[PDB]
């Protein structure tokens, strides 16, 4: 169906332990496909998915240069941020960036993204119109003025509407065997007595891809949101994800509870119950 490509940058200063480390990871949906680490023995963009390995030698040289240039650019950005925030050179700071595009089934651009953060807080972001910016504070407004003066939004827009969607389109074709295959969750409900008055019903979702999924418990047909323990979706390590939702129910009332699962790999939402 819909797909996304996203690149994530992390630049971290470490005074007294060398120059700031720069890392870049690229994803198509929930699949990591390329990585770059400035701390590597011979830093370069490296393939992390089978379908990207066929890209030509020029691809890898261009991609690697982009990252090496970025290593220097972001070290500069870190020095600039210190000035913008009147901070000393003794602390460790982090700049993060995430940018990319989302495309619909027809492969046409749905939305473009470009956002930056400093020490975990929003710094600046390209608005959805791909022509204006939103600065979080007076320091970011300084960068905004610079980027507006240099027509940066216009250059990003060109990229987001062209190369971004064009490359994503190619990757989806080359990796269609996996990128375009949704693996439905394998589901089951477990029963764990807590006391003599209440028991724990845990609804499991295993081996699914992509990560997006919805697990909910209902009591007599009513959602138990405020009464459901839901763990964060986690990676299994084989490309798939796992997740569970649990509710504490009075002994003898387990049949009044039903688990509901929604995943794009399911032609229809599923309803589960404790099967004693």
């Amino acid at each position: 169906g819909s797909h996304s490509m996203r690149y994530f940058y992390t630049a971290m200063s470490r005074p007294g332990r060398g120059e700031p480390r720069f890392i870049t990871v690229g994803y198509v949906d929930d699949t990591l496909f390329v990585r770059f680490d400035s701390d590597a023995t011979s830093p370069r963009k490296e393939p992390r998915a089978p379908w990207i390995e066929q890209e030509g030698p020029e691809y890898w040289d261009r991609e690697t240069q982009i990252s090496k240039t970025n290593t220097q650019t972001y070290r500069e950005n870190l020095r600039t941020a210190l000035r913008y925030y009147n901070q000393s050179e003794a602390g460790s700071h982090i700049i993060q960036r995430m940018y990319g595009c989302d495309v619909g089934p027809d492969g046409r651009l749905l939305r473009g993204y470009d956002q930056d953060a400093y020490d975990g807080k929003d710094y600046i972001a390209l608005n959805e119109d791909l022509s204006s910016w939103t600065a979080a504070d007076t320091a970011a407004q300084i960068t905004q003025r610079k980027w507006e003066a240099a027509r940066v939004a216009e250059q990003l827009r060109a990229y987001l509407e062209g190369l971004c969607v064009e490359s994503l389109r190619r990757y989806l074709e080359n990796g269609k065997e996996t990128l375009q295959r949704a693996d439905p969750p394998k589901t089951h409900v477990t029963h764990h007595p807590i006391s003599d008055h209440e028991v724990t019903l845990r609804c499991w979702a295993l081996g699914f891809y992509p990560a997006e999924i919805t697990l909910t418990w209902q009591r007599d047909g009513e959602d138990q949101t405020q009464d459901t323990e839901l763990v964060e979706t986690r990676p299994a390590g084989d490309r798939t994800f796992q997740k569970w939702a649990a509710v504490v129910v009075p002994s003898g009332e387990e049949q009044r509870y039903t688990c509901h699962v929604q995943h794009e790999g399911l032609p229809k939402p599923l309803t589960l119950r404790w099967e004693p």
């Binding site: 690229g26 982009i66 960068t143 990003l156 490359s167």
Partner: peptide, 9 residues
């Protein structure tokens, strides 16, 4: 493929 242009803060 990444955007090949960099712009400083």
């Amino acid at each position: 493929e990444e955007f090949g242009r960099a712009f400083s803060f």
